[PDB]
């Protein structure tokens, strides 16, 4: 985006390490964080649509039981 104040465009990065590999969002597919398109996964949010927030004592030594969510 530094490349946003002279006009310029299409940044790409990568990884790269011992021994090379990942580690990158542009392009792995350049999904522009913005957009939205294909199949992008779950991991989207508490059964608490927040408001319901309080003392959260569903815990006393959870095991298996939550670690987490």
């Amino acid at each position: 985006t530094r490349l946003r104040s002279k006009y310029k465009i299409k940044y790409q990065f990568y990884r790269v390490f011992p021994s090379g590999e990942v580690q990158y969002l542009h392009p792995k597919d350049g999904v522009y964080p913005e957009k939205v398109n294909p199949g992008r996964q779950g991991v989207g949010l508490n059964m608490r649509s927040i408001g319901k927030n309080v003392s959260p004592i569903e815990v006393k030594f959870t095991g298996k039981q939550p670690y987490d969510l």
Binding site: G51, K52, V54
Partner: protein
């Protein structure tokens, strides 16, 4: 019937809230949880304000 009246806010979510009147607009588009479009003249830590709402709430008088 009550389109944007002096109607309340009532859920363990909000900022302002009890603070009364105003449902301004209401949609007809079902999915979500956010049908109830509110705008008053009093504000949270934004400035534009107005954020949206609905469901386990309007527990109010006239």
């Amino acid at each position: 019937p009550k389109r944007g009246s002096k109607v309340k806010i009532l859920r363990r979510e909000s900022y302002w809230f009890k603070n009364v009147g105003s449902v301004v607009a209401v949609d007809q588009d079902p999915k979500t949880r956010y049908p109830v479009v509110v705008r008053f003249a009093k504000v949270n830590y934004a400035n534009i304000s107005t954020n949206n709402y609905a469901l386990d709430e309007v527990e109010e008088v006239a």
